[PDB]
Nucleic acid binder design. Structure first.
Lengths: 76, 96, 64, 52
RNA sequence: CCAUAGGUUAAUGAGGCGAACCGGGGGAACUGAAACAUCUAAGUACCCCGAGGAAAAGAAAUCAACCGAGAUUCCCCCAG
RNA sequence: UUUUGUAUAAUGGGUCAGCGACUUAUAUUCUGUAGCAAGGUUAACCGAAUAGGGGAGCCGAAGGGAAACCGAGUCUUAACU
RNA sequence: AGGACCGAACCGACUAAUGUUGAAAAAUUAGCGGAUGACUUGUGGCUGGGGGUGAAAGGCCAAUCAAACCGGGAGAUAGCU
RNA sequence: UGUAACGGGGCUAAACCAUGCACCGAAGCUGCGGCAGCGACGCUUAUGCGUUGUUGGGUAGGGGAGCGUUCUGUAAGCCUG
RNA sequence: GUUUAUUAAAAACACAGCACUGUGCAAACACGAAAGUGGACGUAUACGGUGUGACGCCUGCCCGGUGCCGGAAGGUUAAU
RNA sequence: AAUUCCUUGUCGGGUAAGUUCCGACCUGCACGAAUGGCGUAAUGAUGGCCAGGCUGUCUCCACCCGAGACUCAGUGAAAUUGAACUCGCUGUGAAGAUGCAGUGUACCCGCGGCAAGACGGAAAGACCCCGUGAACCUUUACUAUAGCUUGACACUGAACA
RNA sequence: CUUUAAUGUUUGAUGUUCUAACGUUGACCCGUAAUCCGGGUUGCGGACAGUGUCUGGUGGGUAGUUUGACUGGGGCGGUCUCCUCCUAAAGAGUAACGGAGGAGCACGAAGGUUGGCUAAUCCUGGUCGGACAUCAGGAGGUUAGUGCAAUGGCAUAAGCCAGCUUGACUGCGAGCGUGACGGCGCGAGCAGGUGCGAAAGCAGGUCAUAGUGAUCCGGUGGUUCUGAAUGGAAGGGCCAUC
């Protein structure tokens, strides 16, 4: 046959969920596209990884006219 | 270090450095050893005779480790800043 | 008689103050123009041997 | 893999050089760029040279 | 041709044996490298010659480092 | 005994008695115990001698760096918040 | 005259039976082939192991032969039982 | 190979469905007595002693504590014609 | 005729004959670190190796590949 | 066909009937000319087929003579063997049961026979696989090497063109 | 210097002649009573032959070995590293010789910044012009595009166009993600200097995920770091790289 190949898993997914206290610089989700968009206090890395810029609790919300999922770091 | 036929850790990592010949003949001296010698004047011959450094040693430093309490004359030895401060605080004298 | 040290290991490891071992990073001997400068920069300082493979280097180096 | 690698030597006289690749069949002219030279701590002109 | 080679007496000595040690002339492979050829095992096993109660080595064309030590041999460190 | 699994129709033993298998030397790490303690300890050897002498040496109280070197700090770097 | 014919000693072993812990670690009985020749046999000698010898089967080399036997390296090694 | 597709005998319930009350049934649980491990707690600890919970199937394996055998000191002692 | 002594006697091996090739004698070749010895006290009508196997009729086409023989002008090439 | 798989190719002979044999045919999977082609008198403990004589080889076995087997007296092994108070059937289950479950049958113990079972005995399976196992053998596998061969230097010198 | 020769000398190649080294398994004499051997006379050959050291070719004649693994038993066939979806049971991970496809590159702009723009497809009209070129209008709303496979993204566009440029910088990095480990990946911010923009700011390569090779040994450049008595040097170290 010609179907024996496959690639190693990339271990994506949400790494820190909502209402979790995190330190600055910690990865929140590893994604391929921009499935979740960066909100307040969250930056977008080279491979679309959303990372916290300040210490606080993770906040998920749906915003915008396109109903996009935003991740922000609530103040703490 | 064998891990099956897989290339072992002590061969996966690259070699570094070289062995210095001067480090085998250079020693360090605690402040506590200054009182142990007799005559109050320290140098290479007196330290060797007092079995503190080693017969093959050619250079030696005095370090701020422990503490000295008696006046002592250091001659021909490098001395650190803290060690120098403690020696002079205890009435010592350092020369070259 | 005395145990013979593994000279290959002796040319690659040195014992530190608390009993660990330092080593040079891999992937910095040849082909380098395609590697990101950030990776090379992070690979330049020496590192400490991990807990998993600490036993092997202690076994290979009986005389520190 | 027709793209072969080269080195950009600094014009500051220091031996420093960057390294990259180029397609020598479609771009025969030499490469010149302004890059940082960490020895003199200034951005100087680097010129393409033979990798050797 | 002289001579030399060869031959015949006389005197002195050697030959062969023996457990280990010593010096010399030759000299593997199984094995380890997780295979194997460099390498290791190892100048080991074994064969041969010679000598002695010991043998071999031995009185610097030696080390050291600008200070010095003083033939050879063996033991403990240096040091895995 | 070996196995996922054996009354197994898988292996071994006819039976009894005797013999038969984690030892020894030298180094290294950890635990317990005893001595001494910022010190501990001697090896060959001398010695009529398991005493005593012998501190040649080794480990420890300082480390960082590839190294010169610096030192309760050191390395990187022109310099590190 | 003849590596001629039939056929004993002698040499060999084609077929069957028995025997297969046998009378025998290959033989016995009834048949069979050569039987003056490239025959067969007695006595003594020569060729030694990666070597010999072979009208050639890897046959034979002291009931052992795709490398004899004895001693040594040697308690080889064995991720196997 | 032999009934051989209730384990068998046999059963018109001694089968099936629904409801109800009994009883049998294990090394489960409870009763009585005994041994040992680990945690609380207190004694005046012989450094382990009352009570008190609770645990105790077990291969590879890890940890702890013992019995018995030959020899050496104790031991020219002690037992034995 | 010979052969697997001890499961195979044959179409297998050998054979006289045929052909190719090497060899001019201190021969090639073989056993020997070598001396030497066999070949052979033989000399191309001889000796060794290879293939085929009495006798009758024959052995036809291919030198591209791999060997072997002859040539040395050119390219390349070791020690020195 | 010592060679043809398809194939017992097709036809003819022999037989009542012939996958073998003999004689042709050619569609030679994949004969062939000294790793010789096709014949060949004589020869063969050579391979295949047919015929006459002959027969217990067979239809189909029967009797007889001896040597064992059987009994008595004397001597007296061996392979094997965990222990046995060592039955049949169906099912279960390391999945083919003397040994478990259910049931049937069977008083205790020899002797002569037969060989279905005890996955019987003999030989740590030879076929198969595995081991970074071994031994030989082959070669334009790898790396060497004896031998043969080439040149430089040495033993090795003097004149001339 | 383009253009070549003389006198003598520096040493090679080829050929001829000679004897004295060397060979003689030619003849004769002696040791000798001897087809070995040695010495002598002589004849033939002759600096050839032969032998030693070094060196190229040939060399299963001989020797030491190698000839992988996965595999519904082995061989043959196929596969061995990396990326995308499903298998994968709504966090991560998850096997088969399961189902389907790709990668071993490319780019000095196809990267950075500032400013601007919106496709695919279809209808209608129009010279060559045609079902399909370019033009105008409409419908449509990303069914298009992304340097390439697939998945997840993308209108503030990450898609398309133009100007200026090298942040495809150097030393670092709070804190995480994923690995048994070697390692791989994301990262605000600090210091120096740079590009675009008036500026807030953005820029440590490309919309992201494949585009790859540890160590040893060796090569190049820089740096007194080291340098076996001393001063150098060779060698070694470090940084950059093959």
């Amino acid at each position: 046959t010609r179907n024996g190949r496959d690639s190693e898993a990339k271990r994506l997914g949400v790494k820190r969920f909502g209402g979790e206290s995190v330190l600055a610089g910690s990865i929140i989700v590893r994604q391929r596209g921009t499935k979740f968009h960066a909100g307040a206090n969250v930056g977008c890395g080279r491979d679309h990884t959303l990372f916290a810029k300040a210490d606080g609790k993770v906040k998920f919300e749906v915003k915008g006219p396109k109903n996009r999922k935003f991740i922000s770091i609530e103040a703490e | 270090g064998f891990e099956g036929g897989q290339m072992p850790l002590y061969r996966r990592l690259p070699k570094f450095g070289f062995t210095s010949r001067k480090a085998a003949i250079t020693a360090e001296i605690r402040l506590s050893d200054l009182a142990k010698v007799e005559g109050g004047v320290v140098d290479l011959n007196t330290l060797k005779a007092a079995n503190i450094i080693g017969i093959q040693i050619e250079f030696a430093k005095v370090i701020l480790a422990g503490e000295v309490t008696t006046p002592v004359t250091v001659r021909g030895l490098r001395v650190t800043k803290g060690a120098r401060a403690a020696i002079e605080a205890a009435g010592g004298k350092i020369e070259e | 008689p005395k145990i013979k040290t593994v000279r290959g290991a002796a040319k690659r490891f040195k014992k530190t103050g608390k009993g660990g071992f330092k080593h040079k990073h891999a992937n910095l001997r040849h082909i380098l123009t395609k590697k990101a400068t950030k990776r090379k920069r992070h690979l330049r300082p020496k590192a400490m041997v991990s807990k998993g493979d600490l036993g092997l280097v202690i076994a290979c180096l009986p005389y520190a | 893999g027709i793209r072969e690698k080269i080195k950009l030597v600094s014009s500051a006289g220091t031996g420093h050089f960057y390294t990259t690749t180029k397609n020598k069949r479609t771009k025969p002219e030499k490469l010149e760029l302004k890059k940082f030279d960490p020895v003199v701590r200034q951005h100087v002109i680097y010129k393409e040279a033979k990798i050797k």
